[PDB]
Chains A and B, each alone.
With several copies, the nearest count.
Chain A
Amino acid sequence: DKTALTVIRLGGIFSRRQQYQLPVNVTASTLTLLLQKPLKLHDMEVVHISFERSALEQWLSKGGEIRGKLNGIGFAQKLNLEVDSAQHLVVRDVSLQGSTLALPGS
């Protein structure tokens, strides 16, 4: 709860409502994100998902599909991810249950 993740809006001239990661706050080549409400994803319960920061960038800009290794381990699985109205990242399970993503503590 100590943390959420507020994606910063980027303007300019583009077709989509583009989004941006925090400038240097998050610069980890592959960063892991915990979830406020742990979910049942791919027949297992997951408390954290690690992303390649590079892959999360282009998805925040161009959209499309985004994979992420559940609980940091195994294969990079496809994810039902969306940018929230509160500017958060929300993952959904097969019940469409949402969960906010947070960046780990110091």
Chain B
Amino acid sequence: FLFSIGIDKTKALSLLRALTDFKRAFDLNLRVKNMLPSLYREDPEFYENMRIQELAQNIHKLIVHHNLPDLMYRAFEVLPTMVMTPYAAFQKELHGMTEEVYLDEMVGRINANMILPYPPGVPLVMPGEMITEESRPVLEFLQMLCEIGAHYPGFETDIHGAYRQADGRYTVKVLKE
């Protein structure tokens, strides 16, 4: 929260009160139907009987189980291998020499686009870089994100540079051979 010159007594009270109201409403375990009506309308049947604490538990259990923080930490602690520079790869693109491959097939291939996953919102693979064995945790984090994020409507995976085909598989752009 940023305390700007905008923020007055009315806004501070509304925020402060809104925070105590979240706790109050959470602890009563209100139905998602009642506490999150707009979310409910997205899938009435999916959300009909779910209570706010159950939504929290299920997503948290996923995080706990998939050990998300450790996997995320490790994905960004090593660097993919720079096979060519981003500029060098762009020369190939300038001539239209790109194809798509599936995410599963990307080890040993030269990436054409930046791959920017959310979370944590910073570049993972640059154009011209390649996942190897030295940098396998990169691919493992990516596959893990696709799995953990496939469970709840409204909590989808989000990786820029990967293209979700209408069939639910992911592709990436690579340099042609």
Measured CB to CB, the residues of A under 8 A from B are 6, 8-12, 20, 23, 85-87
Contact = CB atoms under 8 A, between A and B. Distances in A.
Contacts of B105: 23
A80 to B, nearest CB: 22
A8 B166 contact: no
Contacts of B173: 11-12
A6 B100 CA distance: 15
Interface centre among A23, A86, A87 (most CB of B within 10 A): A23
11 contacts: A8-B100, A8-B169, A9-B165, A9-B167, A9-B169, A10-B99, A10-B100, A11-B163, A11-B171, A12-B98, A23-B105
A87 B100 contact: no
Nearest to A87: B167
Nearest to B100: A10
Contacts of B167: 6, 9, 86-87
Interface SS, A side: loop
B102 interface: yes
B101 interface: yes
A23 B100 CA distance: 9
Interface SS, B side: strand
A97 B64 CA distance: 50
Contacts of A20: 99-100
Contacts of B101: 23
Contacts of A10: 99-100, 163, 171
Contacts of B100: 8-12, 20
Contacts of A12: 98, 100, 173
Contacts of B169: 8-9
Nearest to A17: B166
B96 to A, nearest CB: 10
A90 to B, nearest CB: 15
B166 A87 contact: yes
Given A8-B102, A11-B100, 9 more contacts: A9-B100, A9-B166, A9-B171, A10-B99, A10-B100, A11-B171, A11-B173, A23-B99, A87-B166
A-B pairs, 9 with minimum CB distance: A9-B165, A11-B163, A10-B100, A87-B167, A23-B101, A9-B166, A20-B100, A11-B171, A9-B171
A85 B166 contact: yes
Interface centre among A12, A20, A85, A87 (most CB of B within 10 A): A12
Nearest to B101: A23
Contacts of A6: 167
A8 B165 CA distance: 8
Interface in B47-106: 98-102, 105
A5 to B, nearest CB: 13
